[model samples]
Target: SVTCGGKQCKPNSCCVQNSHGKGKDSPRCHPLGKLNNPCEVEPNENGIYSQHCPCGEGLSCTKVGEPNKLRCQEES
Candidate 1:
């Protein structure tokens, strides 16, 4: 069991980290959402990089552009 976003999450759930550079202390947990839920922040565009939220089981994180965002989808 883990505390995510101030809520307790189960073991099967995924814990997503903050990638935006806000210097947040903890991560958020996804328990009852879809496979590719919207993240709180966009992907890194500068030279620096970090771990973003994750997709559902068997899915990968895909970076969508123009606005520079992220989404979870099936890997090709």
Candidate 2:
């Protein structure tokens, strides 16, 4: 449960807001989320972290059948 802030994550890992974290140290770095995993657009453009690696590269974080739910998948 290592916490990362301001893009301190190493290669392959990305920062995600702690599901239960709050305040200044609410983010942590983990591996890139896999396809079909829930995700969101990166608030940090550097791709260092955000709701799970923004759903990996070459994938889309668009909505699914759940509407507001964001799922990771390839468009084509």
Top candidate on lDDT is 2
Error of 1 at 23 (Å): 16
lDDT per residue for candidate 1 within 1-76, as digits (tens), equals: 6556667778656556554677764666544324565433333442112334444455665677547566666667
Q: Root-mean-square deviation of each candidate, in angstroms? A: 7.2, 4.7
Estimate TM-scores for all models. 0.40, 0.58
User: Which parts of model 2 are misplaced by more than 4 Å?
Assistant: 1-3, 19-26, 44-51
lDDT of 2: 0.65
> Which segments of model 1 are wrong by more than 4 Å?
1-8, 15-29, 39-53
In candidate 2, list every pair of residues with a backbone clash.
none
The local lDDT score (0 to 100) that residue 51 gets in candidate 2 is 53
Residue 50 displacement (Å), model 1: 15
Per-residue C-alpha lDDT of model 2 across residues 1-76, encoded as one tens digit per residue: 3336755557666666664544555577677667888777665553345455665566788788675887788768
| lDDT (CA) per prediction | 0.51, 0.65
